[PDB]
Amino acid sequence: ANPLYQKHIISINDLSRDDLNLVLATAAKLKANPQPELLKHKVIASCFFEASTRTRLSFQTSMHRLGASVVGFSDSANTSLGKKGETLADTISVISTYVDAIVMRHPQEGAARLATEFSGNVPVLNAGDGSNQHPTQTLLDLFTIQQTEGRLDNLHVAMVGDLKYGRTVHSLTQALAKFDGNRFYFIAPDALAMPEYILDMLDEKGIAWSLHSSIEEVMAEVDILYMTRVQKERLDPSEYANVKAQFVLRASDLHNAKANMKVLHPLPRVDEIATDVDKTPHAWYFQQAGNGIFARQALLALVLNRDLVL
């Protein structure tokens, strides 16, 4: 049976370098040769207790692109009868008697981990558990880094924006810190810097990283430019709008960018990447969303299928 078979995908941190790679190989296969009736006759629950349409439509399209039935809800409010006293434990205890897998996004951390404890042996897949993990995001970021660059080792990756609270940037650093030779350039506001523990893990492994004031300081060195969305509401309006000449990307700043450089961004995007960056070759965030389908398809195929022939 494959490594990940009937295994719970809850954190990037719990998956090994070999598991990451197995996910990315599968994904690249399904992409080339679609198997549209692999999960035929499975019913999957898409339980968004916090709603996100992009993630939910990446995941439900993944299930359907592999011929699985879906049942589910989205929320950020009162679900339905699920609100009055029904503990998440009890909700899972009942839904794991109906479905074959549970994809769930929830607002409080460790919700998918508590869930694992009530699933019986129905695998749960973490589509976001508060500010803790979002491993499915990181697999599609890694697949896209890997697919534009040829590898995941010896890359000079710049990470920009809210490095303090961006969930995706802390998972992705961990993940790329399981591969050899990587150099990270962290560009963020003092108020939104890379948390000390990311940095300290990075040092225990001998990984080279550096803090930079702006993007045009690393522009020429960077293979991947991972932008994250700077959140207005976490900052005073005058504070946010200040930061000298900002950390937004525009097309002219891409003139001294390497040929192979791609600008990735988990999305929504509003301020931080300007529309002219879209028609540049270095624009890769919409294709990055597209690669969510293959990353998510792979993950449902391996967890739900014994021996995966592709």
Binding site: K232, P237, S238, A241, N242, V243, K244, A245, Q246
Partner: protein, 146 residues
């Protein structure tokens, strides 16, 4: 190049691309009066310069000074009978009105019938601009990112 005038102001030595900012921002075209504008004029002396000549118009005192933030090398010249009678350089004002925008999305200047007013403070490696309203101080770099 463009020929000389009888009376008026000739705002010489505008660096390139600023000459159009000056027309828009200081609304100098809104006069049905003779204006000669030369943009991307050579003058070996700067590579490229722009030069607005507004005939029979005299930009006085503060007006000269408001140009200080945009083209601070512009020689402003009076001509009031066939030749250069006075010559002036933009001096930084203590306040800059109307033309700037407050960078603070939550300043009330943004929705209301209100002229921006900023106080000029020159703080060594730049000029700070402090809004009349929200009272926040900004590097002019941020007020002209715009």
């Amino acid at each position: 190049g463009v020929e000389a005038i009888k009376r008026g102001t000739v705002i010489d030595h505008i660096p390139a691309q600023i000459g159009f900012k000056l027309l828009s921002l200081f609304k100098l075209t809104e006069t049905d009066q003779r204006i000669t504008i030369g943009l991307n004029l050579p003058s070996g002396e700067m590579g490229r310069k722009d030069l607005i000549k507004i005939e029979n118009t005299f930009l006085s005192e503060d007006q000269v000074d408001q140009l200080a933030l945009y083209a601070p090398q512009a020689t402003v010249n009076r001509i009031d009978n066939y030749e250069v009678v006075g010559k002036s350089r933009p001096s930084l004002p203590e306040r800059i009105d109307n033309v700037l925008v407050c960078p603070n999305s939550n300043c009330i200047s943004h929705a209301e019938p209100v002229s921006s007013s900023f106080a000029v403070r020159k703080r060594a490696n730049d000029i700070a601009l402090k809004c009349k309203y929200c009272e926040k101080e900004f590097s002019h770099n941020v007020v002209l990112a715009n």
